[PDB]
Write a protein that binds this ligand. Structure first.
Ligand SMILES: CC(=O)SCCNC(=O)CCNC(=O)[C@H](O)C(C)(C)COP(=O)(O)OP(=O)(O)OC[C@H]1O[C@@H](n2cnc3c(N)ncnc32)[C@H](O)[C@@H]1OP(=O)(O)O
Length: 145
């Protein structure tokens, strides 16, 4: 897998295909993409963008750490899963975040992906909550200090 920087606009197709296929494309244009210091990473394989991840500074009231970042739009295309594409994006992001002096990376994880974040060393906090139309979620975080 080759990890490369990508632009916000480059994430919309895979966000739409994988995460929000039953919603208008506008639902994939996350307002958080326009928050200060937002960045995006792409995983490329065989000449195709096959994994995406987006990060921006956001301090969660129920997590402790002076500087925190949120992960949004984590997705790998069917056919290209189980190749460490997603893990490679998260590890590369952790280097960028550690260099920026971030203390923590968090995500409102789909529960169906909780085991992925667990394998990457994330812990769960709090309770499962539902967010229609995209289902049960759980706050997960990884301290990177
Ligand atoms: C709010 C959010 O952004 S959370 C949304 C997460 N995305 C989704 O749910 C969309 C659909 N799923 C996906 O896109 C992918 O399955 C992802 C992003 C969760 C994982 O991407 P991949 O590129 O396949 O991950 P990668 O290959 O790095 O997997 C790392 C490890 O986690 C495991 N893993 C991957 N997905 C899952 C899962 N859904 N549940 C449990 N374990 C998982 C892999 O088996 C691997 O384990 P191993 O090292 O023991 O073999």
């Amino acid at each position: 897998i080759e990890v490369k920087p990508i632009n916000a606009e480059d994430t919309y197709e895979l966000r739409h295909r994988i995460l929000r296929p039953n919603q208008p494309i506008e639902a994939c244009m996350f307002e958080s993409d326009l928050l200060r210091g937002a960045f995006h990473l792409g995983g490329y394989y065989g000449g195709k963008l096959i994994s995406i991840a987006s990060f921006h500074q956001a301090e969660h009231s129920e997590l402790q750490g002076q500087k925190q970042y949120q992960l949004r739009g984590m997705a790998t295309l069917e056919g290209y899963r189980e190749q460490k594409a997603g893990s490679s994006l998260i590890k590369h992001a952790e280097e960028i975040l550690r260099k920026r002096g971030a203390d923590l990376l968090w995500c409102n994880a789909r529960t169906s992906a909780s085991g992925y974040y667990k394998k990457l060393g994330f812990s769960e906090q709090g309770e499962v909550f539902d967010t229609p139309p995209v289902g049960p979620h759980i706050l997960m975080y990884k301290r990177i200090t």
